[PDB]
């Protein structure tokens, strides 16, 4: 979500990069809305009534992201398989280790899967989509991510940038989250935030970004619980007994 000029920036090459059926690469922080992006890119492009697959490669195992990226065998189809005509969506892509990422690159150049048992190669016809923070380059040169792969998924890569680089939208966001809590809990109006709220807000660097501002926002709003005057107290750290 956001209004501020490199937002828009990002939507604007999301709508030229989306028709193509070339992989993107999408470098951001958690909460972000990396996925929120490449569903974009699906509902934009042609494949947009085909389906939309998403995995995080860093929450497997090196056997078990395999299965669940290629499948394996009556049969486990893996979410290369269940994308066929449509978007698969790959987060946090630099965990996957060596031996994956030299199959992804396989897939994405010969546009099949491998297969054992007397059965055919699994064709398939798959847009991708990949993200991460990392810094593949970096992981290239120490030998943790394949060059050849990032020679190939790069076809070109949007930058979201992180809240606190969007200064415009920390206050525009903290706003509509703020009024979404009041309604949540029946409050008639959202007070406002006092000075003290805006600088501890506008000072924070959000590692969490746009997920992290709304659950400090709502939680802020409900431990001020009035709408009788403007709320004063952000609570970035729940653990904090204030």
Known sequence: LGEANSFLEVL?????????????????????????????????????????????????NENLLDSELFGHEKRHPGRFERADGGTLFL???????????????????????????????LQVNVRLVCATNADLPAMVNEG???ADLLDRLAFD???????????????????????????????????????RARETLLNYRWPGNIRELKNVVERSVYRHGTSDYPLDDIIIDPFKRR
């Open 144 to 146: 943790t991510f394949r």
């Open 91 to 121: 987060d946090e892509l630099a965990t996957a280790p060596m031996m994956v990422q030299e199959k992804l690159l396989r897939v994405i150049e010969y546009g099949e899967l491998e297969r054992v048992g007397g059965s055919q190669p």
């Open 12 to 60: 604007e090459q999301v709508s030229h990069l989306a028709p193509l059926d070339k992989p993107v690469l999408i470098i951001g922080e958690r909460g972000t809305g990396k996925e929120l992006i490449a569903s974009r890119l699906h509902y934009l492009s042609s494949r947009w009534q085909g389906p939309f697959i998403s995995l995080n490669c860093a929450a497997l």
């Open 157 to 195: 890569v949007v930058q979201l940038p992180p809240l606190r680089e969007r200064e415009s939208d920390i206050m525009l966001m903290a706003e509509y989250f703020a009024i979404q809590m009041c309604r949540e809990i029946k409050l008639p109006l959202f007070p406002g935030f006092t000075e």
